Amino acid sequence: SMEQVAMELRLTELTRLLRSVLDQLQDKDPARIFAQPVSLKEVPDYLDHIKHPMDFATMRKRLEAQGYKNLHEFEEDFDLIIDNCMKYNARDTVFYRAAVRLRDQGGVVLRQARREVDSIGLE
């Protein structure tokens, strides 16, 4: 149907905006601490601690499959990256501190992303 095509165009449009958002967020992680999933070979107990692992590569996979239907779902995954890190790692670690900086700098990006999604009407 034509309605279904229109819905798909909106989703494709949203996916384009989120790709830009994702790139901007990942630029705030120049150490690439959050670029890939935590290795279960190198951190064998990880899933005992963290029940829903997340990372930028995994987000990018979901994004390219147009698997984010709205900005809230995207934000949920970004928050998992930060929140998982701040639980597994202690305050005095480079990992925890990197997550704090990513959350702070990323907030700016997400604030305007929300305005753009609402304004253009992409969800």
Rounded to whole angstroms, how far apart are CA atoms 71 and 77?
Answer: 10
Largest CA distance in the chain: 56
Resolution in Å, one decimal, please. 1.6
The residue type of 120 is I
Residues 6+ apart with CB under 8 A from 74: 18, 21, 22, 59, 63, 68
Rounded to whole angstroms, how far apart are CA atoms 85 and 54?
Answer: 10
The residue type of 89 is N
Determined by X-ray
Q: How many residues does the chain have?
A: 123
3-state secondary structure of 70: coil
Question: Residue 75: how many CB atoms within 10 A of its CB?
Answer: 17
Q: Which domains does the chain have, with CATH numbers?
A: 1-123 (1.20.920.10)
